[PDB]
Design a protein around this ligand. Sequence first.
Ligand code: CLA
Ligand code: CLA
Ligand code: CLA
Ligand code: CLA
Ligand code: CLA
Ligand code: CLA
Ligand SMILES: CC(C)=CCC/C(C)=C\CC/C(C)=C\CC/C(C)=C/CC1=C(C)C(=O)c2ccccc2C1=O
Ligand SMILES: CC(C)=CCC/C(C)=C\CC/C(C)=C\CC/C(C)=C/CC1=C(C)C(=O)c2ccccc2C1=O
Lengths: 39, 223, 48, 75, 75, 773, 148
Amino acid sequence: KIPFLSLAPISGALFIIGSVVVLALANIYAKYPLLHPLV
Amino acid sequence: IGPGDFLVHHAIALGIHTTVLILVKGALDARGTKLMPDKKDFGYAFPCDGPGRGGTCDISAWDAFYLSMFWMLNTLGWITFYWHWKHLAIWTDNVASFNTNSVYLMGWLRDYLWAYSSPLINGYGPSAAVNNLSVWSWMFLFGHLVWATGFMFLISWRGYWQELIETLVWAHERTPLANLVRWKDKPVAMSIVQGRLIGLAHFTVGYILTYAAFVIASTAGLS
Amino acid sequence: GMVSTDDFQVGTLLTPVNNSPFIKFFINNLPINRPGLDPFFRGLEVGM
Amino acid sequence: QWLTDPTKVKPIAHAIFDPHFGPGAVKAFTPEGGSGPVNIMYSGLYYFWYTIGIRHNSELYEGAIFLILLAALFL
Amino acid sequence: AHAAIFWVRDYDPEANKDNVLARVLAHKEAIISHLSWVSLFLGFHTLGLYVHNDVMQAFGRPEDQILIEPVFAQW
Amino acid sequence: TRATVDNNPVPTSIEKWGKPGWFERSLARGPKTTTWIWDLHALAHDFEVQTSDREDIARKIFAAHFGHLGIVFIWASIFFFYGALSSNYASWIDNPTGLRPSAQFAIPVFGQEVLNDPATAAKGFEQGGIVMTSGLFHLWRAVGYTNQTQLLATAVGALVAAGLMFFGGWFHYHVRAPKLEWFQNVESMLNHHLAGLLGLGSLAWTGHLIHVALPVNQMLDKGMKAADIPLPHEYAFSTEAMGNFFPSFKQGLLPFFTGNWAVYSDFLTFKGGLNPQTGSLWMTDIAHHHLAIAVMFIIAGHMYRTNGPWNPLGLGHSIKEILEAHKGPFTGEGHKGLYEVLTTSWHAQLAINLAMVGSLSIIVAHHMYAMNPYPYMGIDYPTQISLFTHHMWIGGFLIVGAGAHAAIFMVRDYDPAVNQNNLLDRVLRHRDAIISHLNWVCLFLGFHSFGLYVHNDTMQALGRPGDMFADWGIQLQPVFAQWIQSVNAAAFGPNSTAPWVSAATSPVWGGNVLALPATVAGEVVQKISIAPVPLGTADFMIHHIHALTIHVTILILLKGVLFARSSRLIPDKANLGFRFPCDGPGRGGTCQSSAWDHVFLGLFWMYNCISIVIFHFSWKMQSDVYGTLNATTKAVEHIVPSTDVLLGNGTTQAFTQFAASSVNINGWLRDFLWAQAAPVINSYGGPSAAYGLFFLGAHFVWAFSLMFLFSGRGYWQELIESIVWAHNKLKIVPTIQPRALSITQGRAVGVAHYLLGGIVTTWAFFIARFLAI
Amino acid sequence: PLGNTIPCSESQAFKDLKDARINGLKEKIAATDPATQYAKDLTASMELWEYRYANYEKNASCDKDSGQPHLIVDGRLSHAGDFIIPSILFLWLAGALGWAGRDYLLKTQNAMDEILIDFSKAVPSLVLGLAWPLFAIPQILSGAIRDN
Ligand code: CLA
Ligand code: CLA
Ligand code: CLA
Ligand code: CLA
Ligand code: CLA
Ligand code: CLA
Ligand SMILES: CC(C)=CCC/C(C)=C\CC/C(C)=C\CC/C(C)=C/CC1=C(C)C(=O)c2ccccc2C1=O
Ligand SMILES: CC(C)=CCC/C(C)=C\CC/C(C)=C\CC/C(C)=C/CC1=C(C)C(=O)c2ccccc2C1=O
């Protein structure tokens, strides 16, 4: 257990921020899709 | 039918299901729970069991009726909002307005709620003389007033009004020419369940008259 | 000096709005309080 | 009068006696060819009464008499 | 309402021993928690698709909104 | 005196960071339920329930002040970085009237770049941007910023100042902390917040205006561009450069020491109102202002007596002798005790101080539209609506907190031995008369303002426009307010009551419509910054609405204060505390009897008050002040047009839209709230599309509040009993117990979301309306 | 071509919204300086939007009348990317989060571990969340707990 980053707001809020950044770069890399392309 | 139709049918399923959640919850928990395992001895309508055990506000089955009433009004608002906009878009030869703007909620605010208010709120005005829709204009503002008057009883609760009526009782008994006139029933604040029920009755009456005024004056003011 | 109470349990204050002698002469000789008057005449003068 | 042209002249619910009305509202709730202010019916009773076969105000009057006496029978 | 009024005033668990009414009193948390799941389900997704459609009309992109034909009711 | 300070009370460690809730005894046992989580947040700044020692309490408050001044310097640095890196300030300084001010863009990601307004696109800032409404750039032009690197230097200096305030907090709490005897010498702290904080602050600000801000604004008004001098028109070595701008007296600071003051009558003037060229206050009047109040604040800090090793110094006043000298026969023993009140209670001081700073922010909101301080500021209409609306809302919030901490004093720090026969005691002896008479005057104001509005709705609906309380019907003329407009308009000339004034107090009193050069695409001069603001029947009515809403907010908060300790219902309410939900369903029901609940109710009534104030301002400024001069024959065309009111005889009469339509609720609904919301709902796909999204989201948050406001927690707790059953059936068992929210905290969540949703709806509406026209 | 539904390859209104967006973009490039970071962003938006309308073209998105792409959800394999692939993606990542949190509760059972997150027992909970069906299916086939 490390100081100040093991706390639930920091661990939680960096999970929301890391998720929206990885989702965001998934939207750049897959060019903001509406669906999945099959063809 | 198309995708705004899809979205508002899921809103309808949402409204009916949440209203069923509050009501089946108020039916089956009415005899007893873990917060209150002897609730059936206290009847249908009672305020609470007080601030202990964390606090017991709105614990009666009457209160889950009471809270499901707002959800029924919101549900049936979504139903008649749907019926009204889809039919007014048919009746004004503008079905592309519904098929484009019913999928997003500024279309509901703008192209239904703001757009069709125009013959209603011009029922009376300073520059144009009145027409037959001035009574629905006055009923529209009346229902806004009654609905918002409900919010006083819904938000502000009892012991403020009991202390305020105690100052009023002091003011009457020390005013000359007027302490010679006495009440027979002692002025008290309305009860807890009474404050809920009167706030619901105002909310509900204002809801019905506001929507009835709009659904009649907007459709009669198409021409 | 101006504000006394003369029965301090009773929730009232004896104040120059309350206890000035011409205000007591006015209020105590308004027709509902003026002595020697049958209630009908008190009502009559209040009505007029 | 509504039976002669069903499609343009509006059903009338009842006529208005409000002493609060000024001249604008008296002209407003009066239709064309009307002798005073009325309420335009939006409950659909004229279409109901046409489809069940009422064509006269005297049939509406005997309907009124029959429902008052039927209510008196239930009381 | 009068369902809950029945529950407080008129229900007897002894005459209704292990009939269907006592069994849905017995597993009441299943019915309430599953109505809770249906309500949260419909709300999260209906509000999310609506607010998506709001953001896409806000961002100048009407052809990026999520549009689902109701295929079951047209069937 | 003597600054008696202890050394090292608290060691600097990390050991309490791993233990949340250390500061209160029930929180220190560990989380068992979820209410601990909310009890962790509600008790974090309540230092009086953490430790019982008032000295340590005062040190916690002091270090909290340094940390707050640090965070305010971080915010100050944040808008200085945004004005210094990604702004159009290098091109806004050359076009303050045709270029919309911006210091923020939206980056090329998710389609948000339609939010970039192309009326902010200029050189350097060639992307478009978010138009701001704070008026930072006009402040910055008035104090002399012509360059973005010195804005960067201010940004770095504000971060250094934030670091200094944090090191001051850590030093004055953890290393070397003051005692309780240091805080209670209120005489010296008043003497050094008047003469030193306000006095030398505005004296040094007068120094800034004279050396920097008056010459740079004279160069910007005489027509030269951003290529300026910032270092060679200063100091001793270019003293003659003070003579090249506006003639620095005869020679140097020699006529300051010799006493001939009249040769400085060129950059310390008393000319009067607003400048016609820039629409704002004359900068010489601003400098002579801050110097005269600077002087009178150094006189103000010479009042209270301080004794020490200074020999002849030590003449003056003790505050206690002044307070115990004012007795009266009506008021018993007067202000005795109030010195001990205000030197031992923090909540009483905070109640006075929140009342004064909230009142002062409301005062600020009036006087900055009324006198425009900054160049070309009054023509940028989103900034005018936004700063009036901002300072009104901040003022109302601090007045509700004033009522809050007055009631918190009355719960916690009231001592009956100190408050024997003083004003504070005898207010509590006739609290029924105060609250009942207040209840009567709120009823009178509500009937005789709102029933007038309801009467106007009724008579306009019934076809009786002459029966209306209006300027064309039953006239309600504000004859006292119109007479004070005539007095403040008339008091400038020769043979008046202020003989040496050229251009009066303000043009709002009844003198002249003032207009400014601006582009607006390819148009002509137009742009009324300021005009006379006439008062009629609608102003009578809206001001009695304002008196109503102020008086009900007083009634709620003051009934919270005087009935905090006891009532006829609950005589032991102070033992129940400031913040309790109720005392049970008995005595009929005692719901919302605590004084906290009166802060909770007074928050919505403050919402009512300030919302009708900013609604009056939006429609009023829009209907009678703001607008356009026509290119043919200089005719005034306002932002909303004039209304030809149909009279009862058949003819019309021209009124403005506030004078015609703001007399009933139908015109407020239609011509104000339906008509001007057309640019917040049509804003999609463009630069104001976020304000549409904030409008809809704030409608959501406002309606989301009413779940918490209209319901209560026993419903939610037996619902969470069913959801906890669903979790225990699938072996998903939290040790922290899922609870319903408490009654007080559910009320707090509801008032927070009601306030957030309504004020952000109204913010979105104001900015998205005022960017359009 | 379903009800109120034609594909993108024969839709007139999709061509209208398409060439309306591409034309409004090309006079947005054509009136600006191509070396000022605005116009490079518009050419990136132009290339991005050409392949966005081309991907709506080539995988049979469906429009009719109003021209925007209408998603058909039945379980059709031609329209498999409408619902079925983000279904499997949602059940994978949401079962990862739910199973990771559930396993974190089953290994901690402690009140300090919920507000103060133990990463050494939270990140491998997330790793077994990334393979949650192999640990979740035979506990469905076994049973959870006896409570009423
Ligand atoms: C009354 C209000 C209330 C409140 C305040 C809470 C509060 C809480 N609940 Mg809860 N709960 C409630 C009601 C409430 N509950 C109700 C009504 C129910 C239904 C019965 C539940 C059932 C419930 C369950 C089942 C659980 C909680 C848990 C929690 C805790 C969550 C901690 C957290 O969010 O950080 C989140 C921490 C993480 C996400 C850790 C991962 C972070 C990584 C390691 C950081 C590294 C990532 C890096 C930055 C890169 C980012 C990229 C990314 C994509 C990976 C929290 C204290 C959970 C808990 O116990 O804590 C774990 C839990 O499992 N609750
Ligand atoms: C980008 C799109 C999107 C977004 C933002 C969401 C967001 C959400 N969904 Mg969701 N969903 C989506 C697409 C999306 N969904 C699609 C396309 C489908 C169709 C397959 C679903 C089907 C779905 C289900 C069944 C549920 C959600 C639920 C939720 C909510 C919490 C889920 C969570 O991970 O928390 C953390 C994870 C947990 C708390 C536990 C994981 C539980 C998962 C979601 C279900 C797995 C259980 C079981 C294996 C399958 C259920 C049987 C089912 C066939 C009925 C959340 C707001 C939940 C909800 O709405 O609450 C009522 C929920 O039960 N969604
Ligand atoms: C529940 C309702 C809902 C649903 C179903 C959607 C659905 C969608 N939105 Mg949306 N949105 C919503 C609510 C919703 N939104 C709300 C409420 C808002 C307001 C905040 C928005 C604002 C919004 C914007 C501004 C945009 C979207 C976009 C999208 C689309 C693309 C998402 C995507 O595929 O990424 C890509 C997915 C992949 C490439 C799959 C790979 C996933 C990797 C492997 C993991 C990433 C998942 C996650 C980060 C977990 C971490 C895993 C960990 C192991 C690292 C998608 C159809 C975008 C769009 O273009 O619309 C068409 C977009 O521009 N949304
Ligand atoms: C100089 C200003 C000042 C100071 C120093 C205090 C100090 C204090 N107040 Mg107070 N108050 C103030 C002004 C001030 N107040 C104002 C202006 C109001 C009117 C709103 C109030 C009304 C008030 C009440 C009703 C109470 C206090 C209480 C307290 C005490 C503890 C509060 C606490 O623990 O923090 C805790 C802080 C929180 C839990 C934050 C609450 C959530 C905030 C408000 C939401 C923020 C939203 C944000 C602004 C905008 C949205 C952003 C979001 C979307 C991310 C503390 C002594 C409490 C007490 O018990 O007194 C002893 C209490 O009962 N105050
Ligand atoms: C629109 C809704 C609404 C209305 C009309 C009111 C009205 C009132 N509030 Mg309330 N309040 C509200 C919402 C509302 N509130 C909400 C949401 C809250 C929650 C925060 C509160 C909380 C609150 C508190 C805590 C207090 C009030 C007080 C008052 C009274 C103020 C006195 C006054 O204005 O004079 C006159 C009355 C009016 C302006 C109401 C309209 C009167 C119409 C125009 C006259 C009708 C004519 C005639 C009588 C009709 C006869 C017809 C016949 C058939 C019956 C007043 C009766 C305060 C009080 O009691 O002080 C005296 C008090 O302290 N309110
Ligand atoms: C370990 C986390 C966890 C898991 C496995 C579940 C699982 C479940 N929940 Mg629950 N819940 C949780 C957390 C969790 N929840 C939290 C934190 C809250 C407070 C917001 C709730 C509030 C809640 C309600 C009101 C309901 C459920 C319901 C349900 C059941 C139906 C599926 C669903 O509706 O999803 C819905 C999920 C949510 C509404 C919560 C959103 C997702 C949370 C935030 C995930 C927690 C993340 C956690 C911190 C991760 C830790 C990682 C770890 C490695 C450190 C299902 C078994 C429903 C039910 O009773 O079904 C019969 C029901 O109505 N949940
Ligand atoms: C026989 C008969 C009925 C004659 C007519 C008698 C006559 C002349 C007028 C009819 C009375 C009227 C008009 C008002 C009195 C009602 C009242 C005590 C309101 C204060 C009050 C408010 C405002 C709340 O929000 C609230 C919320 C929750 C619990 C309690 C309360 C509460 O108590
Ligand atoms: C990083 C981050 C943001 C983490 C979030 C932390 C995590 C994971 C969960 C936190 C749970 C959350 C977000 C909310 C719970 C609030 C709740 C149990 C509300 C039910 C409730 C309602 C709806 C009322 O109206 C009401 C009215 C009057 C009295 C009581 C109540 C009441 O109790």
